Write a protein that binds this DNA or RNA. Sequence first.
DNA 1: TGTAACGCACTGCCAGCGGCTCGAAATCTCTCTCGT
DNA 2: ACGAGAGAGATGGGTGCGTTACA
Lengths: 174, 174
Amino acid sequence: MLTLIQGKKIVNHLRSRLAFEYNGQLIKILSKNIVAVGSLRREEKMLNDVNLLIIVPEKKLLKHVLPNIRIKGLSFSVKVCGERKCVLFIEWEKKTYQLDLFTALAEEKPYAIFHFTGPVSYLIRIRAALKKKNYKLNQYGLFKNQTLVPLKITTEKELIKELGFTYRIPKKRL
Amino acid sequence: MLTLIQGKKIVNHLRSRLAFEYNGQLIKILSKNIVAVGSLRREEKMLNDVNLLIIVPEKKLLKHVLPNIRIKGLSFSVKVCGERKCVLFIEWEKKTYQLDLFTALAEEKPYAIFHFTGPVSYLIRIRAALKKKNYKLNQYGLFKNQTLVPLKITTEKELIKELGFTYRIPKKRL
DNA sequence: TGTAACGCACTGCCAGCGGCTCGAAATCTCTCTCGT
DNA sequence: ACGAGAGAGATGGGTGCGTTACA
């Protein structure tokens, strides 16, 4: 278990210490393409895990980034790993804290943040509401029939207002 | 053999009693998606078999519907059975009668109905007409040089008229 | 005119490198448990 | 509401004939 302040710290320590192994090449992860999500982004007092979203530019990389992820100077086991979700246990200041990692591509970014910020109940209200208008929403995008609806948006705020919903900051989503 | 009357009785009996097994689930076939075809849709006095065209929504389901087909409370053996055609022998009022089932995916429905309605001598006239115009028509769609000619059509009638042919009632095709 | 189910011969190509079996080795689905 | 990872369960060589059978 953690506190908000500690989690923010850990998030700061990792922005600049991220890289994955690709054809024997250790490629850096720009902090520009790392977004914190989960109970942390919803400025909660007490945490459980830390969740970060990693943005991947090129489709072909997905198989390489999460399974072969590297962190400078930190001890970390691994519980499960896929291309899209990863669960690590790290040691920080001599203690064990769960860390969760996720992955989205450029045009998935707004949908991805909005999905992973949450919280659940808020997602559930939203997705149900658009289900009654024949849409499906997920972390990938908006879909009407099979075909994914292309939306002229770029930011999460932009996306929410496009989905015709009051925009609230993350710590007021229920 | 069967009287047309006995045939209508059977189809009607069957409409609300068709289901298949799919992952240990017994899935009800909607009478909405059960078309009667062959000699019975052509309203012949004397029938030899009973022909049922079943409409399957999701292509993935073809390998489950027909091979795991069940009929609530009616004896039947199975002569042959595959994904697309399946041949039964049922006990009805202490007599053995042959029942055929065929399948069609939603977007084939017009061609299928048209196909299975028959009769053969009619289809030949028709297919041979579209052949000399470099087409092939079959239960699955219309083709030109191995390429599916898409048509915005949704009924057997629309299809026939789109094909440029005088619509005849099923009982008047020869 | 146009297609399906099925049993089969002839291979082709892996588990088996000789067999055309049973059931290996690798790949699928589904089911479960998990996330937000 | 809508997806993921990881086991479990299940498949079991491709062709292409020829024959019977469907409208």
